[PDB]
PDB file of C-alpha atoms in Angstrom:
ATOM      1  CA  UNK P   1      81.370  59.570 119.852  1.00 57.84           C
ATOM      2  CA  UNK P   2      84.451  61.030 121.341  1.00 57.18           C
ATOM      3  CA  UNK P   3      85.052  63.138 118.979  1.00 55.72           C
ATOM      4  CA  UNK P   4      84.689  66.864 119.348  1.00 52.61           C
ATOM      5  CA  UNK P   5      85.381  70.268 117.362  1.00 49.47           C
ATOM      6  CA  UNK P   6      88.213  71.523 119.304  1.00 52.01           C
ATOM      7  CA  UNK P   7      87.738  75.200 118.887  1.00 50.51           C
ATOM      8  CA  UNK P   8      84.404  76.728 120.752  1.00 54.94           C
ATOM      9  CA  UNK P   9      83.094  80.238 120.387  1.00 55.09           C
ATOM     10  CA  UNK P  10      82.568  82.600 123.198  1.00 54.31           C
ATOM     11  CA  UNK P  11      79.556  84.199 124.817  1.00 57.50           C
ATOM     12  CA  UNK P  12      79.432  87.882 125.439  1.00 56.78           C
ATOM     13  CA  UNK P  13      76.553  89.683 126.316  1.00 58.48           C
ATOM     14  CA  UNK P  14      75.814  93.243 128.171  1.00 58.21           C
ATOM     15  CA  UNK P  15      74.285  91.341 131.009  1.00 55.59           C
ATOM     16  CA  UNK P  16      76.696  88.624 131.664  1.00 55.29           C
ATOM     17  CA  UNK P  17      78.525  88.081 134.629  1.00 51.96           C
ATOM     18  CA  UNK P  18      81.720  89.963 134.877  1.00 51.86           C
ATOM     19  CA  UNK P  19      83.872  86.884 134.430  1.00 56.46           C
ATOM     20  CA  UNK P  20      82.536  86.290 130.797  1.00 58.80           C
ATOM     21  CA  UNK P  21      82.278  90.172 130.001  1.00 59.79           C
ATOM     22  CA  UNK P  22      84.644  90.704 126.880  1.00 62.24           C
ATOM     23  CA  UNK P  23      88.241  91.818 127.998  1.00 63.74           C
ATOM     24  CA  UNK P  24      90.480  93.184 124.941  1.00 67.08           C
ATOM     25  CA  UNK P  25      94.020  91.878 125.775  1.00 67.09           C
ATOM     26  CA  UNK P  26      97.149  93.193 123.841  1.00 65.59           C
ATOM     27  CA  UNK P  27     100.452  92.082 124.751  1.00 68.94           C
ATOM     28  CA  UNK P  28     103.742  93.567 123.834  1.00 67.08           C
ATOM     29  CA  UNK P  29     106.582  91.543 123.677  1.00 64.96           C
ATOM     30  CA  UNK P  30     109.684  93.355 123.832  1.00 62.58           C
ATOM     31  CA  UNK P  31     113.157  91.354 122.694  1.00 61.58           C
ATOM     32  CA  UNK P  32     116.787  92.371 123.422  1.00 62.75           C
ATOM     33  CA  UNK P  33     118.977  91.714 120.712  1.00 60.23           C
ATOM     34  CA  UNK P  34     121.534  92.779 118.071  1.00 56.94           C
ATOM     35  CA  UNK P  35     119.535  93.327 115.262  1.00 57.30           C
ATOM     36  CA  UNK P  36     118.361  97.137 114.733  1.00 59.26           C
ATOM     37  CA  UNK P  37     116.463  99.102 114.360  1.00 59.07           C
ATOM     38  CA  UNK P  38     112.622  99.212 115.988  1.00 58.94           C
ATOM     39  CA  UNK P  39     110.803 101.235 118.124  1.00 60.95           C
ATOM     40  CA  UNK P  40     112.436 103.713 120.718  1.00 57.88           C
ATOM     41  CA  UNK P  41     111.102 104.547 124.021  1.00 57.96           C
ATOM     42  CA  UNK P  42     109.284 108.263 123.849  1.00 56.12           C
ATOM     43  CA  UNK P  43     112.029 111.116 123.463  1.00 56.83           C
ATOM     44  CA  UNK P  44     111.258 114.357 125.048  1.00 53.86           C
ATOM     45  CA  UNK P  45     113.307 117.589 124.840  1.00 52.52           C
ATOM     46  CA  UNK P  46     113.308 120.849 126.997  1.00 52.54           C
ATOM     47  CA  UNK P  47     113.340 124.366 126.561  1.00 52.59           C
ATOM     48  CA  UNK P  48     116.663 125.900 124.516  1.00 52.61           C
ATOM     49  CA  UNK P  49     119.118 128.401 126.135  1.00 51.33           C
TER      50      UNK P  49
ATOM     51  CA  UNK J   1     126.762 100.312 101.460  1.00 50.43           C
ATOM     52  CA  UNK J   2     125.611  98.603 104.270  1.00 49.64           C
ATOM     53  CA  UNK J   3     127.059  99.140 107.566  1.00 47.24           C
ATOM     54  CA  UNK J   4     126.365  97.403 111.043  1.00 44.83           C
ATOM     55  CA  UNK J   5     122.591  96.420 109.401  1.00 45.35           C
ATOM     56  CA  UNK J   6     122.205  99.981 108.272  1.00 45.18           C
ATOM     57  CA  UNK J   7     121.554 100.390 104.913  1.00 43.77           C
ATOM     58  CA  UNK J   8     123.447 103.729 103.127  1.00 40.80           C
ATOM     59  CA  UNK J   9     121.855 105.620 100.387  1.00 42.96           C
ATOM     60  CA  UNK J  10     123.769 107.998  98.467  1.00 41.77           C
ATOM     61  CA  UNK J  11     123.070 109.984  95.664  1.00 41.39           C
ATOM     62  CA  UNK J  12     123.909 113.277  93.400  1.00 42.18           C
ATOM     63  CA  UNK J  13     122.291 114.421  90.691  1.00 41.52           C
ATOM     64  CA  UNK J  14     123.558 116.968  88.371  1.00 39.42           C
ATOM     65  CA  UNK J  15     123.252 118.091  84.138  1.00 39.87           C
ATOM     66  CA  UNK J  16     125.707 117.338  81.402  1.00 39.79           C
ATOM     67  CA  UNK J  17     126.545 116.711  77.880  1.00 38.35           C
ATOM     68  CA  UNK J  18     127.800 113.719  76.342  1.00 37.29           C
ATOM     69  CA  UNK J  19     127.943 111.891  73.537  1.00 39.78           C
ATOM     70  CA  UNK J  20     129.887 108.725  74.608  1.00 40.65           C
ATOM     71  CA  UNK J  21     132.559 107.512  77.185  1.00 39.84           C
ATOM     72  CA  UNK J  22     131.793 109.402  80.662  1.00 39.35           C
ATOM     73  CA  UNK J  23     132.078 112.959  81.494  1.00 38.01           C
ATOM     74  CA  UNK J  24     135.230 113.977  84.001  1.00 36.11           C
ATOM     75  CA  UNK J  25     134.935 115.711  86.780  1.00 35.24           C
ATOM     76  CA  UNK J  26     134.449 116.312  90.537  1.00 35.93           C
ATOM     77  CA  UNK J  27     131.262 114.966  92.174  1.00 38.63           C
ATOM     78  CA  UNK J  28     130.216 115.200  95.934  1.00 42.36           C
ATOM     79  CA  UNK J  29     127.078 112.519  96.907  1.00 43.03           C
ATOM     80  CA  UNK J  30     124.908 113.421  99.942  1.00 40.68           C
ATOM     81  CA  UNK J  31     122.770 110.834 102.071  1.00 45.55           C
ATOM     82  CA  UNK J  32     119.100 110.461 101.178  1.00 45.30           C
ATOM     83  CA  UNK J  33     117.481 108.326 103.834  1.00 43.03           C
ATOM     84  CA  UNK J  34     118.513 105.501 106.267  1.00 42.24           C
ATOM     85  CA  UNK J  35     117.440 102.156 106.184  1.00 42.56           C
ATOM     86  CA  UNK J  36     117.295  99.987 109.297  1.00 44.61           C
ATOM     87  CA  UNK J  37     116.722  96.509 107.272  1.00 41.87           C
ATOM     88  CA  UNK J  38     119.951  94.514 108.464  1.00 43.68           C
ATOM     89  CA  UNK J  39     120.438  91.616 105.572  1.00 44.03           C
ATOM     90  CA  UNK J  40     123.120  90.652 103.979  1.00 45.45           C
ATOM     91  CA  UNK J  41     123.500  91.404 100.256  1.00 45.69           C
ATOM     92  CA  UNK J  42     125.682  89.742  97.873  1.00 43.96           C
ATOM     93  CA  UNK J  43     124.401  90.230  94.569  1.00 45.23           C
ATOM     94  CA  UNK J  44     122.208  93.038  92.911  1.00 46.12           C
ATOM     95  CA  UNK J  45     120.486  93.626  89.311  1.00 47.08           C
ATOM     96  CA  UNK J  46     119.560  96.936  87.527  1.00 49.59           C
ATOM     97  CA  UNK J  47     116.325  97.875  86.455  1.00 47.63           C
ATOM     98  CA  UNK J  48     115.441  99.794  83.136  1.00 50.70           C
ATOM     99  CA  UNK J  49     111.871 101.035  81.412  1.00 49.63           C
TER     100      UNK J  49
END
């Protein structure tokens, strides 16, 4: 009594309704700071002369 | 050495012979790779087989 398991497992299934079809969700946080080095942003080059 | 958080590896590798003391002469290290770590180190140990 008035106590419940806080976590609750989701339902996905082919034919369910679009709002409980599985979504995969990746988010990429991307900090500013003064501590290198990470990623770079792509790099392309051109043809040489 | 480590400079701005970049970590400088330097190294030269050549044959000698000696029996004790050091050997004298002229030496000229090149850069091996670069390490983006960015800690600060203040002590270091040596390892042997």
């Amino acid at each position: 009594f008035n106590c419940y398991f806080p976590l609750q497992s989701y339902g996905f299934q082919p034919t369910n309704g679009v709002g409980y079809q599985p979504y995969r969700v990746v988010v990429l946080s991307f900090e500013l700071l003064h501590a290198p080095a990470t990623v770079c942003g792509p790099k392309k080059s051109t043809n040489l002369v | 050495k480590n400079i701005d958080g970049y970590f400088k590896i330097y190294s030269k590798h050549t044959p000698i012979n000696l029996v004790r003391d050091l050997p004298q002469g002229f030496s000229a290290l090149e850069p091996l790779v670069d390490l983006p770590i960015g800690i600060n180190i203040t002590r270091f140990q040596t390892l042997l087989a």
